[model samples]
Target: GPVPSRARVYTDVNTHRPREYWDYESHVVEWGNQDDYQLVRKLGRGKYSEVFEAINITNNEKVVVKILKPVKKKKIKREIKILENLRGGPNIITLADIVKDPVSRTPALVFEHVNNTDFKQLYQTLTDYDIRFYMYEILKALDYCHSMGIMHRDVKPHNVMIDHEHRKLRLIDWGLAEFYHPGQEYNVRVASRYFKGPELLVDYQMYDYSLDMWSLGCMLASMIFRKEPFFHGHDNYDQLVRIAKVLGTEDLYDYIDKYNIELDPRFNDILGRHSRKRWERFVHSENQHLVSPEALDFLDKLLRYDHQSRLTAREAMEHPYFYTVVKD
Candidate 1:
């Protein structure tokens, strides 16, 4: 077995921060009055929370009201703490307040609302410049979060809200985020299945910020190929299968061997040896407009079997693919 792998960069960020910043469970929260916000309509619903379009009646500002589902006490606390930790970072969702229903004890997170055209529609309409532009924005968000010693495990399109007209991008949903502390074993069950990294699939608990890079690359590939999900796995076990099919079984085995990972036994039955697919193979008439040598190179660097080999968010921002973006 290899040594517990630490992140390539920003390894000691949390070491320099105060205890209260990372010690989420012990932190106390100030509650805001929920009555100030009035719901307009249900925006969306998910496993952990329900999102509602709302307005701050006091200031008459459009806002999003995210009501927590019946979940653990500390889960909510950790979510709040992570949000607080990454507050003011570029492209990060701005949290307005934390309020609760007195009698029901239902908690709601109040925040700024982005007039986001759902990713399903927005991605299709994006120009090459728009794609490059917003991706750089997301990298800035992820880079800033990592700078503050936090990892947003849930890095998917749904959590990234973009307003095309305003050129605004915000990385939302810190619910699945955690503070990065080297050498600590974390739960492998974090990111949404399709977006899960190889380390998570192989149960490598020492994963860090690079997890988001893999998820970001998946999101990028889906955009480039016009495939809603580039890696569509039936379940957790199959998720690795989906990944290995494209990444090749050889590299998957190398990653597994490096970590001394014993994969899910179920993988034994369905898993088969496969060759690594080429990035150019995904470029066809339908997706040719979005395809470019630079984009493919960027995607290749970001999506690696080894989490450490994947580009860090800052490194991704520095890539040649973003040269035009860096000019601005």
Candidate 2:
């Protein structure tokens, strides 16, 4: 952490790519005529945006219209540019087009609509093989994105859509994604609390691509153990407590100490030293089928306090745990 620690792989990938690939401010998106697309119905709604099932009037092309809230050109351009850079990358979302409201400064991002299966409903039904298959598929997306010198800061179940009928998995939500040109530090307030890594929780700023791996580890653990969220923390500070309780307070302190990080003075109130929770202790009758020896071992490497210690997405795909699921 004192010296910038890059991800285990893909350290200098951006060095070879053109400057235009990483420069979001200079990016331009051709404005699509919003009149051509009519909103069919409200599919989902959030404070940040409203998503609707839209249809191209004359072409009858079905798509998703994500009407974004008031945002700066800086924020909007980056996402569009990143999507353009990864237009054909594995399992990454497809950006169909962008349109703006003529009267207001509002803009909308349109994408190919997939009949998606929500993970909440889907995870409960996932067979052991199904878990391995989809996990590998997501790694393909992660590896592809990481290889392109970008990091998907928001890697969580909500951002992942599965078209189970077609066996298609698309990793969505690039608004939080950023180009990794080796930042000495990053914004600590990123990702949902439950999926956040120890680095983010402890306000470790020098995080890189491995940030996503930690979240992926959290996701896999939650799925395998049938826990809605592997770590449940009420607030950001408490988030570390939840993590330290599992990863072991000693290791957690060791990580922060190595990075020369100072904990919030409040930590003294609740930071009881905990021994690392064993993977076997989490396995029981309910999650028996999901807890294979390889699965547990693979997760162990991923849930480390040190981000660099975690397996790179490419390396994780190479692990024996994924052998049967990925191609020979």
The TM-score of candidate 1 is 0.96
Give the 10-residue window scoring lowest on summed lDDT in candidate 1.
101-110
lDDT of 1 by residue, 233-328 (tens): 989889889889889999898887887777778888898999999999989999888888999999999999999899999889888888867455
* Best model number under TM-score: 1
**How many pairs of residues collide in each model?**
0, 0
Q: Pick by lDDT: which candidate is best?
A: 1
Stretches of candidate 2 exceeding 4 Å from the true structure: 1-3, 102-104, 326-328
Q: Candidate 1: misplaced stretches above 4 Å?
A: none
Cα lDDT computed for each candidate against the true fold: 0.90, 0.86
List of clashing residue pairs for candidate 2: none
